Amino acid sequence: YKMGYWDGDYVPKDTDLLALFRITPQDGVDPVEAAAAVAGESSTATWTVVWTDRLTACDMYRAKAYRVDPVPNNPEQFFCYVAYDLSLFEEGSIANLTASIIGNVFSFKPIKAARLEDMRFPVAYVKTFAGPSTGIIVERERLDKFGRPLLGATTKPKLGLSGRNYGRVVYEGLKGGLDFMKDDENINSQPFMHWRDRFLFVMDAVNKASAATGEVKGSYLNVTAGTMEEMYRRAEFAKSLGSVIIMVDLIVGWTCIQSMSNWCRQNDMILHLHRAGHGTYTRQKNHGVSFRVIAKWLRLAGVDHMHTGTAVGKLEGDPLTVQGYYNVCRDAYTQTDLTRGLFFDQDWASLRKVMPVASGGIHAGQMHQLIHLFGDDVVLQFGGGTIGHPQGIQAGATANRVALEAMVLARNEGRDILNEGPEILRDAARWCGPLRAALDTWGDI
């Protein structure tokens, strides 16, 4: 390796893929050679020399490693920047993207740990993907919901309820002010309640809710299944019932998501992505792939809602870093920001924006913090705080809704969301019984 995989003064072309790794070489291994080895273990390279590539010539068809910088406050760890030529990747294929970039660099022993921190996609490349199947702007216009984050909860009962009772849980929540309801974390179609029956009842609930509130309602009908045939089968049924939104689990795979995204566009559906399982590689800051990258890929794939993070409000991740993720989803042009972990400037070439979804241990009490950290374009997913409300789900819904409504009004008036937050919430709770009870139970933290 190294012989032709490293170029100290190589200037990246605007038509190049840039991958920034956090290489942690073995004690006694040169970081430079490591960077070069990265470039080799994900392209036209090998450990030894091959004659067949003489015809190939490669050169351009080689990943050229350039920058290699020391990591702040942590030696033995280094930021390696690699450049891949545009012609090395298949158009509109995240599976091929991931394949080519990652290669076998994460299993190459001379590197103790390696993590993908960020990437840069040339406009020329970004343009090969359709991007989100709906996007924030379009979604809001289908919802008639503007200038405020969206409200969402989860049908908590899970396995132990029948379709009738499950749908009720949905009706109560939506009517109480929730904009969306989510199928419980892991219920696809287990031996007790069949997905069809659930879909029928849930959609009955959604409709019943719309007619009682006078606004567009929905429920992320989980369409996740073992094969594409089932997945499409459930997607089609969801569509037939008239659902405005659908839900898929990340674990399904890049290729399945792309197919589902394509499907949604051609069927006018919002694709909600549930990032279940990401933690296996997006947790340890020394090995894996940073969620911001996963977020970029997902946007290229065409997802409409994406779980991004609670940010400080709950045990998940660092506020700024979370904002980096949020930026990847809502930026028209992502500007480099080392504090938010953004290492490259990413032009999204007019690809529709993705709706971030804040999930975790949150409640009305944190409203002011959330509104300040995320703003209007975010889906506030309240779980236990809503369902476990003393006066029922509908009450929890109204609580969060009011808490949101008021906080926005106040914020619009200019009031310091942060400092005045508690007061604003108290003022609202004063006339809003359910909010009062919500704060009494899940107050400050």
């Binding site: 503007f146 002010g177 509130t213 006078g214 309602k217 008036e413």
Partner: protein, 129 residues
């Protein structure tokens, strides 16, 4: 029974003082503000009736507020709303309701259930007017 088809609709009716504050917010952001009204608040009845052209470069929230009250007078038994447009991509940024029809006749719109094949239903939400 109350149409929650708008920002702030979960709070008590805004006062002209509060409305002006919002209007300012929009104008401060450089958003074109428009007034609309309809008797049919069907969930997703886009294209309400326009009450005059959008007050584009009207550097006075008070001026808009005037038209609002004027509208309430002309159309008391109607739903009226302020919409803010962002002249950069042309999208709505804020929408809140002001005057609401007399105790919203029946916000529990009649839900029509057409019986399709299987156990599937084809719904039709319709206002009672």
């Amino acid at each position: 029974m109350r149409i929650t088809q708008g920002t702030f609709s979960f709070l008590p009716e805004l006062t002209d003082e509060q409305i002006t504050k919002q209007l300012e917010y929009c104008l401060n952001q450089g958003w074109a503000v428009g007034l609309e009204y309809t008797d049919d608040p069907h969930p997703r009845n886009t294209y309400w009736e326009m009450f005059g052209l959008p007050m584009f470069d009207l550097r006075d929230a008070a001026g808009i507020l005037m038209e609002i009250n004027n509208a309430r007078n002309t159309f008391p038994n109607h739903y009226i709303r302020v919409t803010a447009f962002d002249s950069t991509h042309t999208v709505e940024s804020v929408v809140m309701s002001f005057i609401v029809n007399r105790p919203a006749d029946e916000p529990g719109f009649r839900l029509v259930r057409q019986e399709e094949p299987g156990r599937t239903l084809r719904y039709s939400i319709e206002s009672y007017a």
